[PDB]
């Protein structure tokens, strides 16, 4: 769960 | 009750240095990463860079780089932002608002700051 | 970096009747991983910061009122209130959530007829 990493990555 | 406070509006001259804190409480202030959104008067919003609360690293949209940095204190669980040689299209409204769980949205909004540039 | 476009501008109803409002992006939002949209709709009434409406393009947020939904996918999305109220004026937004840098669209302004 985060959080600290946005984005579809 | 968790919320977002940020500090009181401030009044600059043409070429100084601000920082607003926004200080954030009840919830687990290394989980979820820090948002700045910049408002002009009457203008729209603008995503300028996010902070990482569980790394400290920074990450500026092309427009805010050089003149504006990301700041955390982790024991207040507060966020900082700090622009310098201030110009008079840096007076706005900013916020602090917190990355969500999901990673896909901002959960919860500071109340603004406003920021005034003028001799 | 990817564009937000949102239609129309703004845009003027009697309190009672059905909106829609269009936000078209630049690069698709849809990740098969999750099967999800990384879309974001935000509200903003006069004087207040924004306020979370919708995320993954049909989530509500916790407590939002039934009359909001959200709508579509990969590049075209749409928010449609169902029996506006005079407590629905606001400027609403959305926002890319799949890549750096996370942009907004110019906004859709909803006012009132009386």
């Known amino acids: 769960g985060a959080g600290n990493q946005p984005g579809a990555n | 009750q968790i919320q977002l406070v940020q500090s009181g509006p401030e009044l600059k001259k043409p070429g100084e240095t601000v920082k607003i804190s926004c200080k954030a409480s009840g919830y687990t202030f290394t989980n979820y990463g820090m948002n700045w959104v910049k408002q002009a008067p009457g203008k729209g919003l603008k995503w300028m860079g996010w902070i990482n609360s569980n790394t400290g690293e920074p990450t500026y949209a092309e427009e805010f780089k050089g003149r504006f940095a990301f700041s955390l204190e982790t024991s207040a669980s507060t966020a900082y932002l700090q622009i310098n040689n201030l110009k008079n299209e840096d007076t706005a409204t900013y916020f602090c608002?917190?990355?969500?769980?999901?990673?896909?949205?901002?959960?919860?909004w500071g109340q603004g700051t406003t920021v005034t540039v003028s001799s | 970096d990817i564009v937000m476009t949102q239609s129309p501008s703004s845009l003027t109803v009697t309190a009672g009747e059905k909106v829609s409002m269009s936000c078209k992006s630049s690069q698709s939002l849809f990740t098969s991983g999750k099967q999800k949209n990384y879309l974001t709709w935000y509200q903003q009434k006069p004087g207040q910061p924004p306020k979370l409406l919708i995320y993954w393009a049909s989530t509500r947020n916790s407590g939002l009122p039934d009359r909001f939904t959200g709508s579509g996918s990969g590049t075209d999305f749409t928010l449609t209130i169902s029996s506006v109220q005079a407590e629905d004026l606001a400027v609403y937004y959305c926002q890319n959530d799949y890549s750096y840098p996370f942009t907004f669209g110019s906004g859709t302004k909803l006012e009132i007829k009386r």
């Open positions: 608002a917190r990355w969500a769980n999901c990673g896909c949205a901002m959960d919860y």
